[PDB]
Design a protein around this ligand. Structure first.
Ligand SMILES: Nc1ncnc2c1ncn2[C@@H]1O[C@H](COP(=O)(O)OP(=O)(O)OP(=O)(O)O)[C@@H](O)[C@H]1O
Ligand SMILES: Nc1ncnc2c1ncn2[C@@H]1O[C@H](COP(=O)(O)OP(=O)(O)OP(=O)(O)O)[C@@H](O)[C@H]1O
Ligand SMILES: N[C@@H](C[C@H]1CO1)C(=O)O
Ligand SMILES: N[C@@H](C[C@H]1CO1)C(=O)O
Ligand SMILES: [K+]
Ligand SMILES: [K+]
Ligand SMILES: [K+]
Ligand SMILES: [K+]
Ligand SMILES: [Mg+2]
Ligand SMILES: [Mg+2]
Ligand SMILES: [Mg+2]
Ligand SMILES: [Mg+2]
Ligand SMILES: [Mg+2]
Ligand SMILES: [Mg+2]
Lengths: 368, 368, 368, 368
């Protein structure tokens, strides 16, 4: 039942993602010394000018200059011409820091969860490829293989699909668009060549690459001193690339900068968890689990499972499976998913869903 | 086939929405003197400190201090204690301004469109009520009826639904959560009363209000000097409340601050247009139109119509209807929808979709 | 030998003085936990926006938000309309903090010292009155006597003089100009009355007030919401009001924000010390002691005493007196003057010289 | 009657001086299109971040981005590593601009004027050499002779003197300290050599250079990426280097950023004028002219001439000479000195007094 789809992703150097990372870096920095630290911060950046804002109630001694500059360094901003230098950039900290199982969900909410068997990650091929494309470039950057590669990048992958008396089977990569920052001493011809052979063909399965697949490598020509500038970088502004690439559903809640007590993060992770578990357990080929919460109440206020006719069990057979295998109460979620652990920075880029190294990406058994 | 859903909205005083409005105000200010002005700006705010960033190629004389302060005034920030005063706030302008039909879509893209017949607006009841709730409060604020009401507010509406051999029929409002900024001389008891009788019951259809409907009015107690700080307001960070409240699909593209040449705005409007037209024309009760574009190409690179079995015509009968009634090329969109007109500021709050006063909300005839 | 002179002073609310105080507050905050803390910081302010910049090598845990906001509170900025509120203002900290007798003067330098017997403080009448005028207003502000009085103020005192076979004897106050911030509910007539009876006549000696003395109280009319705004407040920009009101000599070195290791502060204090000691010891009625230092060298590179023919001993009789009573080496200065003590904030306003509560203002014995 | 003296100066790259220049550049930019423009602005900078603040009532169309960036370019900040790049730095403009002979002096004031015959400029040798030292380095920088030389520099000159039955005769340069920013590819040994032969010996008269003269060239080692940070540059913070190097007297009034209607600038210039005229006319070898003004009154409220026994005429013979040759009323000053002309930027560095190219530096005839 043909149709096409497109998704995008950005590198660690993208202004918005730098802020997402810095904000989560500050979250990690607090969890390490106080796993109960209450973090609620965000970052704003603009050409060698980083603004750390926020309200965090914690009892840990943190050097914000250090955690911000280290994060910028990690990203690869050490030289001047790159558009950022951790040693010279302005780090204005306007942060306010205080000191002092059946909890109960804060703020009326509605979290979504999604999973599909089109890839081993249980995530849409389009967004998976988009992320992996950026990931590979960072590897080649950090390894030395492609030393002209700079932190800021953007990726878009559009794949042609076809339904299947259930749902969504990828056929081929229609077109790929990739833009990456770079050093001056490297020709546009050499860049485009390296992008096709060393990054694209090294990550995209042969089955999907074609003789007609369209490539748009460095479309706008050069992107040298571009760096994290844009016109400004912000936290929580890359909401779709952090999730499913526009495939599931999204209520609008941002992740980065918020601790594990905010249902926007925790419950979203939990919802992904059950979704991935369901498909992995063969109970369906594609699911859209919807978990609702009521302010004050701990136990979820109605969970809905949305298969697209890919399950044999039947919604409200699968719900009992979820109700017998999962305890989606906020407090239990953080305990079961080990959400007090400082893993948030690595979650701040290349997508929150898909990578198996995260607790919520490990499928639960599911006793049926 | 019961399930529940929640959506939210924010008032004109919400930090993020102030930036969305200011950014669009600057867009309007340019269109009035140069309908071909190229606008690409964004705003950042934090307690009496507004930062205007951006790159705009136009040929019009604009007083940015005036357009920013006027917008803050319009929102209702004229006094000190409110958290913002257009006469005293810092307006730092770091804006860069230059001077000098079958066009062709910029940037690979994928826009979504959505519509449902559950309301006359052809928008989800949950998000419609959420918006209207905030709208009413602004009215009472500006009229004088509720003089304690302040600009910043947040609304959440969760409605219980039930499918219908097609899709989505609202049954009742399960719970409503509303938080609004206020003056000191007004009791929490009087506020909660006014919110239930004068705002909620004055906008929510009797059919949906119940004896069990849950109300959470000013849950967190007092919200006085809670003016625009919210740890830094930003443009393009309220992506879901500007669209369908998490009901359709969203690629992640922000509207505010971008002119009519960016497919992220124009094409999204166009997609909404056809969706609303389809249901209005009786061709379906609920649609998710998906329009894809290819960088360089003008004509859309595959449009997909997604009814949920609510149409009698059948997808790929409805596609021809769309192909015979619509010309979704970028240039034609702006011409047909009159996108060079300065209406963008009023679009910057209370949702981009739903209100009939916008071109894209006027259903096209549809000759079938 | 008639001539006239004018001097000025500013209140604790003056933008520049707020920065001088905040910078010294940060210095005090470090000395209390590490008397060897290396402080080099400065502040910038602009309408509820404070920027703390600087490089400080210390080993003490300081809450910069607390030390900045407390200082703003102390000044009297607690309400909105005053132009500053310590609870709501933006405190952006871009501060960089590290951790790890015959020393030797840093930086070639030339410090000046001055003293005259026209007042018991051994300071020019014009600047003494100017300071005391502002001091009194703060008292009435903090006591409650004049509750309409606000932090920001400016004072100017011009006195008619006459030489005396030596030097400088004040005759009468020619004119006084005083401007002070205020609350709305207070008439310009009532303000001007209170300024003349309760502040001016309560501090200026009867001998100097005349029937012709000119008063300019609130000349520019109102000064309500003025507050610390100007167009910006800065540290080290009020160099003359911090010293002698334009009577001695000044090389240009700023005090506030610099620790005791900077000769600009320490040596200037030391020079004042010896000057005050000389006149107090009857060795002269007016002196201008000039102490020069050589980078690397500890012992002063030539000290010059400048009496205006007011001494009977004779320059290079008085120099030996100074060389036999004083050891102006940097390290000895800090030890003898107890410069590791956190008294710097109170030094940041109303003048560094004159007030007896400071070590350098206590005359040394002088054995001759 | 031996004694020593030291003075300092800074290059065009010094943070404070960049702000002084930028502020005056904005003043020039307005005078060119509206000679009656009311300018009152100041600048703040910090590592690729320039903040333009101010209130200017004028009727001229100015591109502040252009005037700020052009000024940074002129200074020599075009590359990244230098600590500033006019093409990439953040120029935040928070400027507020409106549109619409016997005047009368604004604000009670007391301006000073100074002159001495020890140099042809009629300025202290110490400050003249200090300025010229920085001037020469800029020449070699802009010519190409010393291509490693960067904008930011600091100079200190200490000269040994001796009185002379009147006053002040320089004997020799005791020590010279000079620090200048530089490029990486240049040895500390080569720099120090070039500073002694090509800059110092090329500007300092043979008569003053000795075999004992002490040189401190690049004392602190390397000053590479030491671009304009210096923990925030500011306008009006280099008050003494803009005048007499601590030789005359200074009330504390700043010049840069203020138009010709502010007595702080105009009257100070006028006072210098008469001082230079007096010595040039042989009426004295050293003078300290003191001009006082009364708020509202146009004609100066008492002028005092202070020779140090270097005049044969006798104070109050010289006063009549000044009263018969000069009309120091504010309005007349601007007319006679052509103060509506945009020459203020070149006045913003290397000293306001001394250079003959300025109106106030051209000695008036003096008919006696
Ligand atoms: N001068 C301009 N004229 C027209 N459109 C512009 C202009 N400047 C920016 N834009 C638009 O807004 C978006 C770019 O902003 P930004 O400076 O944040 O860079 P980036 O972070 O490197 O890019 P991106 O976030 O899109 O991947 C683009 O999609 C573009 O359409
Ligand atoms: N719009 C303007 N037009 C002309 N001159 C101005 C203007 N705005 C400011 N000035 C000048 O510069 C100085 C005022 O600046 P500021 O805003 O720092 O206020 P303040 O700190 O409250 O005052 P002050 O420091 O002089 O005691 C005045 O001496 C005045 O001459
Ligand atoms: N930085 C932009 C394009 C570069 C060429 O200006 C981008 O990431 O797409
Ligand atoms: N704030 C200014 C004057 C007030 C009236 O605008 C001052 O301190 O002189
Ligand atoms: K945006
Ligand atoms: K968002
Ligand atoms: K100034
Ligand atoms: K100064
Ligand atoms: Mg990009
Ligand atoms: Mg592009
Ligand atoms: Mg993007
Ligand atoms: Mg004042
Ligand atoms: Mg005045
Ligand atoms: Mg002043």
């Amino acid at each position: 039942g043909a149709f096409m789809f497109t998704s995008e992703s950005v590198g660690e150097g993208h202004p918005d993602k730098i802020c997402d990372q810095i904000s989560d870096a500050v979250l990690d920095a607090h969890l390490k010394q106080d796993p109960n630290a209450k973090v609620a911060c965000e970052t704003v950046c603009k050409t060698g000018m980083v603004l750390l804002c926020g309200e965090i109630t914690s009892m840990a001694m943190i050097d914000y200059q250090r955690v911000v500059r280290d994060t910028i360094k990690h990203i690869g901003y050490d030289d001047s011409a790159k558009g950022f230098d951790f040693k010279t950039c302005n780090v204005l900290v306007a942060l306010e820091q205080q000191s002092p199982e059946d909890v109960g969900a804060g703020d009326q909410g509605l979290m979504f969860g999604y999973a599909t068997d089109e890839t081993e990650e249980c995530m849409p091929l389009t967004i998976v490829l988009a992320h992996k494309l950026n990931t590979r470039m960072a590897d080649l950057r950090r390894s030395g293989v492609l030393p002209w590669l700079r932190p800021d990048s953007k990726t878009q992958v559009t794949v042609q699909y076809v339904q299947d008396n259930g749902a969504v089977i990828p056929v081929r990569v229609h077109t790929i668009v990739i833009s990456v920052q770079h050093n001056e001493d490297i020709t546009l011809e050499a860049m485009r060549e390296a992008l096709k052979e060393q990054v694209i063909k090294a990550v995209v399965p042969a089955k999907y690459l074609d003789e007609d697949t369209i490539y748009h490598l460095q479309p706008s020509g050069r992107f040298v001193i571009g760096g994290p500038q844009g016109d400004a970088g912000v936290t929580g502004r890359k909401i779709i690339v952090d999730t499913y690439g526009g495939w599931g559903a999204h209520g609008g809640g941002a992740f980065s900068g918020k601790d594990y007590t905010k249902v926007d993060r925790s419950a979203a992770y939990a919802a992904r968890w059950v979704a991935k578990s369901l498909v992995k357990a063969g109970l369906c080929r594609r699911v859209l689990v919807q978990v609702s919460y009521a302010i004050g109440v701990a136990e979820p206020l109605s969970i809905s499972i949305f298969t697209y006719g890919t399950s044999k069990k039947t919604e409200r057979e699968l719900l009992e499976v979820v109700n017998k295998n999962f305890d989606l109460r906020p407090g239990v979620i953080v305990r079961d998913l080990d959400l007090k652990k400082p893993i948030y920075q690595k979650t701040a880029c290349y997508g929150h869903f898909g990578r198996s190294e995260f607790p919520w990406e490990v499928p639960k058994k599911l006793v049926f």
